[PDB]
Amino acid sequence: DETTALVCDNGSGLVKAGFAGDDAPRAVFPSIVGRPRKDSYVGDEAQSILTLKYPIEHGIITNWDDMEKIWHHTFYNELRVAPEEHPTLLTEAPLNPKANREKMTQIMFETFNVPAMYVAIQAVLSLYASGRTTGIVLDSGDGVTHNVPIYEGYALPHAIMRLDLAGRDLTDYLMKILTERGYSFVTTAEREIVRDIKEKLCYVALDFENEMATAASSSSLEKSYELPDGQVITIGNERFRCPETLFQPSFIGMESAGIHETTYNSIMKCDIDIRKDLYANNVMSGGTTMYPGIADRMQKEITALAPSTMKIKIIAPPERKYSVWIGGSILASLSTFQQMWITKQEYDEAGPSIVHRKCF
C-alpha cells in the first residue's frame, strides 16, 4: 500500500479513513481535538481532563486549524502514510459552500503535498456503493441528516433536505428520557455510555403507538445493560422512543417533518418523470440508519405517502455505517475514475477553483 489511493470520509463525529480497494476503513476515530480544561490531543489521543472540540459541525468544516490537525493526524498517526505518495479522495456534505471545497483543495495540495485529489459528495458515494447512480439517499450520521436525490451521479440541490437532528441529538434525548426511570447520565463520559446503550439497545417500532400501548404490558421489551463498573440499568420503551424522534422531531421540540416526510417532500421537489426511479432506489447510509426496524418503518411510511401503485424499495446494507467510505473505495479503485483525479499540475495551473470544474 505504498502508493494506493487514500479515501477519507470526514464526519461530524467520526473520521473514516483507509485505502482504495479495501472493503472497510482501516482507521475510524473521533473527529475531535482535545485541550487541557501536550498543547492538544487529536482523535483517539483525546478520547483516552480535556475539553473537546469537533471541527466539523453538521457535516460542514467550521474550524480549519483543528481540521488541519485532524488531517495531519489521519495521515501521520492513523494511516501512517507519506501523503505525497497517495492520490487522496475526500468526502463532503451535500450543499457544502464553494469556498469550503476550495479550501480543502488548497490544504491538500499546498499543506499536505498530495499528488492528486478529489472531493465527492457523501450521499453520492453511498449510492455508488449500492451499484447505482440514481436514487434517493437518506444519509444520517452523528451531526446531520440529509435526504439527497441523485440523478446519474448529480445530487439535485433544489430537492436536498437537511435536518440537523442526527445521532448526537438522539443520544442527548436518550439521556433525558433515561431520567424518568431515574437514571441520571450527565457528564461527557456518561454521554458516551448512553451513546453505547443507544447503539446496543434502541430500535424503531413499526407501529409506535401500538408499541407504546404494548410496552406497558409485555415484555420482551425491557432489556438490561451492564455499565463499565458492573452495575446494571434497565430500559423499556426508551428503546424505541429514542429513535422515534427521527420520525417525530417534536419529541425534542423540533418543528421539522420526520425523515419519512422529508424523503417524500424531497422526491416531490424532483421532476415528476424521475420520481419512480427515486422510490425504487432509496438507499440508507450512516450510523443513525443502523436501528433495527428503521428500514421496515421507512418502507411502511413511504408506502403510505406515495402513489398506491409505486414500487418502493429501501436498500439498507449491513455495512451502511461505512457505505460512504466504501463507495469512495470503490470509486477511487475504478479504472474509469483515474482520469478524474485533480492532479498537482492541474492545481498549479488553475488554483483551488479547479475543484468546481473537476469534482461534480
Binding site: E152, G153, I326
Partner: peptide
Amino acid sequence: RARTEDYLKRKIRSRPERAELVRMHILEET
C-alpha cells in the same frame, strides 16, 4: 455492497452532461 461494479462503470462512462439534465428540467440552471 453491489454484487458487481460492472454496471456502475458503464453508468459512469455514459453519464449525461450536466447541461442535459438542465435541458430536461432535472436540474435547475445555475
